[PDB]
Please model this.
Amino acid sequence: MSSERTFIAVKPDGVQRGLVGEIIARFERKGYKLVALKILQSGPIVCMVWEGKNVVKSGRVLLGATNPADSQPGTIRGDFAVDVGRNVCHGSDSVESAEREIAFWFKADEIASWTSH
Amino acid sequence: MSSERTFIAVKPDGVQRGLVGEIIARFERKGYKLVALKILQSGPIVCMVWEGKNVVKSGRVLLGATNPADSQPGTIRGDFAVDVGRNVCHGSDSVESAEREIAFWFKADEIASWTSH
Amino acid sequence: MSSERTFIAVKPDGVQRGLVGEIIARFERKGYKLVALKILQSGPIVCMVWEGKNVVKSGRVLLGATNPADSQPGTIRGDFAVDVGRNVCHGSDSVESAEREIAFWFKADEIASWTSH
Amino acid sequence: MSSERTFIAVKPDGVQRGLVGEIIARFERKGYKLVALKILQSGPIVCMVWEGKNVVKSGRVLLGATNPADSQPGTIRGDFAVDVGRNVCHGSDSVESAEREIAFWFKADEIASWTSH
Amino acid sequence: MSSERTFIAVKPDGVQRGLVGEIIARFERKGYKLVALKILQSGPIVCMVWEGKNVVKSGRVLLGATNPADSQPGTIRGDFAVDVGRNVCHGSDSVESAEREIAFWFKADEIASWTSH
Amino acid sequence: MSSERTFIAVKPDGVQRGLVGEIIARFERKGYKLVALKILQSGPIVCMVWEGKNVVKSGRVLLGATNPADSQPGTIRGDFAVDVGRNVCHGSDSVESAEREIAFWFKADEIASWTSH
Model:
């Protein structure tokens, strides 16, 4: 509707195979503003937050069905995943649980903000 | 020689034109391990730290001569910059000042670490 | 069926974000012959005409549903548009109105022609 | 289920238009192990064999419906074919006829094998 | 220095092999404003005009030395040409003969103009 | 001068990181005819033979200086290698030793041949 946020993350298997550039770029080219980032340490992981109108449903469509075997080429699991264990990434589930996800990972100051062009 | 670090950053004009995916990927494909990331707010900026043997001279070669007019296609300023004012990025200058740069921006815990494959 | 023509165009928002290369190439790689081009001046716009068997339905499938929110990644609105106001391009609607569109924009001589390989 | 094989091949029209790199890479990036290759001489052709869990249905989804006019952008016929005569490639049909196809083209020794990472 | 123009063109062999998308995009991504286009009919050809500070020397560096055998990968002849007969394109020679080239091909009205972002 | 051959090969580290598509395509896009292929089994390896006028010096320029630290972005070692141990590939050394290399690996029949377009 306006200025809604959502939460993506990159599982240990993505990071390890060299995919962090690829994911980030697909979000840039759609039009969505990036607003916080960091890494953390099984294996390591990358956390982010993306802002624009509908970022919630759009994200889910970019990623592809959660069971690789069901997803479509053109999407991220469609071009790179094979099983549900090793499925490369997680994206925020609903315009509610965006918050329980964000607020549980990102302290107040970390989130920046600015106007685009 | 081994396990040396260096410091890249993405200027406000890069970020604004949608280049953060592109830069990150060129580092992934050469072989170098990524080890910390964050954003900050003129305009916003992205900070990183990359680890492997020679990451210092390699980085400089990936970016291209500081005066766009002098740099070569195939590199980052060669494919995307036109003048020295608006030149997209900064990369660490020497195996010394890597530190004065890192330590001045990144607190102890932020830097992670792990073994690759 | 044979040697049918159609009419694509690039809205002011496409042109402004730097997409004219991208669109043109997707038509080249499918197999379709290009046969006229020009630019014009809100904002500026790019006009074209493409020839082969079925170019009409194929074009529509390459572009994606007119409401970005409905279209699929892999297509042009799927990878780059977010709302219906700012939806990047227009493609010819039917094997009839191809003409009312062409003939209304392109004078007799402008249309070239040649044999391929 | 485990360690199943399948058989892809590249028709004379693919080879002639310069597509052998493109096809091979789409298989590499999904995760599947390559295990034999060769060429042969109408026109010439390229034969291969790919191994992992489900390689059979996955292959078919990567290629797209056999009638170009029916297939979806993001897939190989979706991005490059126009008619059913000149449709670029053939991929193995079922977990049975994988064999009648393989064994009819590839002598015992040609098939290699190794462990991945 | 400011707002200088230059003249690129695409030879019959480029056009025929499917390169018009590729060339145009390399100019878009550097930063230069596009300002007129058309096609014409041996074989057909594509004409253009590009505007920004230094577009003259930059163009020449993007294309590569005129003798393919001498040019460097990363540039247009470096990635696609083999001999000097069949060398894909022509780019304007000097900030003078930009004019004798432009004015000899493009009537007054065809050249548009606009402000960017 | 005409119809000279040369010999490329892909080391175990290339194959393992998923590069066989990438290499092959760079040869396709320059213009050179492919004429034999196979695989073999430390680790496995891929062998090939490429034909056109000057394929010998061109190949060497596409690959980059043998010491990664010396080579230039835009080339294959420039974009992907870091040390001389793990340097991804080998390409034929001179218009003589093309033969001692070819003939030592490829039996008479394996080499095909055909006319292009």
Residues 20-30 of chain F form the longest helix (11 residues).
